[PDB]
Amino acid sequence: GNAAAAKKGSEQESVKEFLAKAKEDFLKKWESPAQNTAHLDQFERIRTLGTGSFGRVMLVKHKETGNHYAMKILDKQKVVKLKQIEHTLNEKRIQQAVNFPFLVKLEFSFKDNSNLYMVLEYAPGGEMFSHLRRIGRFSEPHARFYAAQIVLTFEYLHSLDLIYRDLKPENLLIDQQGYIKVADFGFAKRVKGRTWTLCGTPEYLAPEIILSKGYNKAVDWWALGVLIYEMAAGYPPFFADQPIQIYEKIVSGKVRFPSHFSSDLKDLLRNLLQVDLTKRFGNLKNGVNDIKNHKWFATTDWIAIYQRKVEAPFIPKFKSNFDDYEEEEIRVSINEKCGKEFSEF
C-alpha cells in the first residue's frame, strides 16, 4: 500500500522514539570510541575462518573467559598500500559505536607493531553466501525473513547518518537462532549529504556509483534489491565474467526476472533496482516505509522480527564442517609500523 507508507502517527512515533534513544547511545560512543580493550596474548588462535585483503579472520578463544570470537587481522602496511587508512578508521569507529540485533558486535580492538585486530562476535552458522550457493536459492518466505532484518538494520544505520556500502551474502552471517548478522564495516561511513568514493562489490554497485555521480544512502537500498534478487533467484540480477561487463548491465536500465518470481516480488525489485533516484524505494518522501508497507512484506511483523520471535526458516546444522585453510603463525615485527596513520585506532 502507498497510502499506508505515507502515514503516521502512533506506530511511527514508537519507531521515532526508539531511533532517538539509539542515536543518543551511538553519539556517546562515536565521540568517545573504545580503544585498546585487549591484547593478542589474551586469545588462543584456533583456525582461520576466512581471508580479507588485509589478513586472516581467525576463530579465537578468549583465555580468561573461554568465550569464542572471530578476530579480523589487518596488516597496517597492506591497509596503507591499498589506501584504506581512513576507511579502516571509519570501520572501527562506527562498528564499536553501533548496537542492533542484526549487527555483528565489535567486542574488543587493539593493535601491535604490525597489525590491527578487530575481535568480533562469532556467528556459528558462517556466511549466508555459503548456504545460498549450496542450497541454490531461497524460497520467497526464506528470502523475506532475511530481507526484513536488512530493512530494519538499514533503517537503524541510516538514522545515524551511516551508509553501509557493502551489502552482499558474503557479509551476512547466520547465528545459532537462524537470524542474520551484518559483518564487515570496511566501507561504512558517517556522512550527511553526498559522498564520492568508488567502493563496494561490482554486482552490488548502484548506477550512480559506477557513473561517478555523487551518492547517498539510496545506494544501500539498490544493494538490497540486488540481495533480495540473488537470494530468491540463486544468481544476481547483473552478472558476467568481468566487472566492466557487469557495470554496462547495471547502468543499462534493464533487468530480467526468473519466471518463478511472484508478481509482488517483481514489483518490489523494480522499485529497488530503479536507476532513477527520484523513484527508488527507500529514497522517496515516505523513506523506508515505502519498503516496509510493500505487498511483498504484508506478512512481515516488523516488531516480531526485531524481537527475534519469528521462527527461522533455516537453522544451520552444528556439530568437522568448517572450510580448511593452510595455517601460519603470526609474526609481529620488532618495529612499530604506520603508528601515526593508525594512532586513533
Binding site: 557493502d166 568508488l198 567502493c199 561490482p202 533467484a233 544476481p236
Partner: peptide, 20 residues
Amino acid sequence: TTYADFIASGRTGRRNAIHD
C-alpha cells in the same frame, strides 16, 4: 538457462570488494 550460465561463470565464489 540463466542459472546454468551463472554456475558456469567465473563469479560464483566469494566476490572481492573494489578498493579502487
